[PDB]
Design a binder for this molecule. Structure first.
Ligand SMILES: O=C1c2ccccc2C(=O)c2c(O)c(O)cc(O)c21
Length: 269
């Protein structure tokens, strides 16, 4: 699909840089016609068919197609798309409150419940995010009594219409499920593993699989080499550990689903 090729600078003024990704830079911006504020994600296009630099148009279009389906309070929403020779520019809802990690169990579950609601939305649409990790969990406004989380960064996300996708889809070693590490078929279940990692870090401030090098982390993930350290998890409830234990499970078929996680006694009201 082709996107708007007028100069984005004719319709928007860009501000401070918000953040980055590989082959992407995110800048604050303001639409001239409404005065409304957005985040402009500039994604660098591949210059040739065989190039390693930049993002292939197939990958850019997938991210855009998924974003267009999404309207939920816990997920970032897409406003407009522009392009030129160098970049595709996604005009995205501005999420200004920072990364969530930037805790009591009540406070953790408060944010975790919103993450689960957002992932429940995506999985209901057969969308696997595949990139879930703390830096992709943002706060809309951190000055409100009840801060809203928004899931961001759909750059790895895929529709799973067959129940699994066989592709090389590989995120950050600390957060990827064993089936990603092992290059096996992937599905919504990989997101549920990442949720278990996030939950472990949310409660303890420690990363369950993190090794001294990337290969060590990957090896730890594939072997499910983690434990709840007493120093970190003393005074953490047994139900909280139960919730994590049922997510960090090598066999994707045995892992809790998003529906299971919402009915788990630690989460369920
Ligand atoms: O880094 C950021 C980022 C940093 C500070 C605020 C918002 C964002 C943000 O919305 C964002 C995306 O939506 C994305 O799709 C990839 C990103 O890297 C970011």
């Amino acid at each position: 699909t082709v996107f708007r090729q007028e100069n984005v600078d004719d319709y928007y003024d860009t501000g401070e840089e918000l953040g980055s990704g590989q082959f992407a830079v995110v800048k604050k911006c303001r639409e001239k016609s409404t005065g409304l504020q957005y985040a402009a994600k500039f994604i660098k296009k591949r210059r040739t068919k065989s190039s390693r630099r930049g993002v292939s148009r197939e990958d850019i279009e997938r991210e855009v197609s998924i974003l267009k389906e999404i309207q939920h309070p816990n997920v970032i929403t897409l406003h407009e798309v522009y392009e030129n020779k160098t970049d595709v520019i996604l005009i995205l809802e501005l999420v200004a409150g920072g990364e969530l990690f930037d805790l009591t169990e009540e406070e953790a579950t408060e944010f975790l419940k919103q993450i689960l609601n957002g992932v429940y939305y995506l999985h209901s649409l057969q969308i696997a995010h595949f990139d879930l990790k703390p830096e992709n969990i943002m706060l809309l406004d951190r000055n409100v009594p009840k801060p809203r989380i928004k899931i961001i960064d759909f750059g790895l996300a895929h529709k799973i219409d067959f129940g699994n996708e066989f592709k090389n889809i590989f995120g950050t070693p600390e957060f990827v499920a064993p089936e990603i590490v092992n290059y096996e078929p992937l599905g919504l279940e990989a997101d549920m593993w990442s949720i278990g990692v996030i939950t472990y870090i949310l409660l303890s401030g420690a990363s369950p699989f993190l090794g001294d090098t990337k290969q060590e982390t990957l090896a730890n993930v594939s072997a499910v080499n983690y434990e709840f350290e007493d120093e970190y998890f003393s005074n953490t409830s047994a139900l909280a550990k139960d919730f994590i234990r049922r997510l960090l499970v090598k066999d994707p078929k045995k892992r809790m689903t998003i529906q299971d996680s919402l009915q788990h006694p630690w989460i369920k009201p």
